[PDB]
Amino acid sequence: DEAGITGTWYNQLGSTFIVTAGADGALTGTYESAVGNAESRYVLTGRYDSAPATDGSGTALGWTVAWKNNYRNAHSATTWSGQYVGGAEARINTQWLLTHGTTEANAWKSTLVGHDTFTKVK
């Protein structure tokens, strides 16, 4: 799945996800969000199962983006957890956690949860 994961992905929000999969299980690339306190590209890093089950199952993976680059700092970090599914319509189905740096008093409202679906098209 190293070949299938590597490339440019887009989600339902119009965000752009460019990633290279290493043979070891490494994930490296850049993320560009279409929404939120974000501008241009952001460094991402993550991991994936380099030897997934051969019974029609998807490939587990995850990656992190800290929302600080040369243009902005949203003092937050998102992690995507999900699986890559190959085939004619390859997808990456994820759920995500967005944690914002806060004081201890505001910790209870520091984390957003959501889900993205990434496709190779559009």
As annotated, the binding site for biotin includes: 31, 42, 80, 96, 108
* By CB under 8 A, residue 14 contacts a copy of itself: no
Tokens read off for 98: 């967005």
- b/e 21-33 (16+ beta carbons within 10 angstroms → b): beeeeebebbbbb
Check residue 59 for interaction with a copy of itself (CB under 8 A): yes
Residues 6+ away with beta carbon under 8 Å from 7: 18, 19, 120
Asked whether position 35 contacts Cl ion by CB under 5 A, the answer is yes
Q: Which one among 13, 34, 53, 112 touches Cl ion, defined by CB under 5 A?
A: 53
> Minimum distance from CB of 22 to a copy of itself (Å)?
11
Instruction: For residue 45, state whether it binds a copy of itself (rule: CB under 8 A).
Output: yes
Q: Strands 42-48 and 59-68, how do they pair? A: antiparallel
* Spatial contact of 4 and 86, defined as CB atoms under 8 Å apart: yes
- Give the interface with a copy of itself as residue ranges (CB under 8 A): 13, 24-27, 35-36, 43-53, 55-68, 73, 75-83, 85, 93-105, 107-115
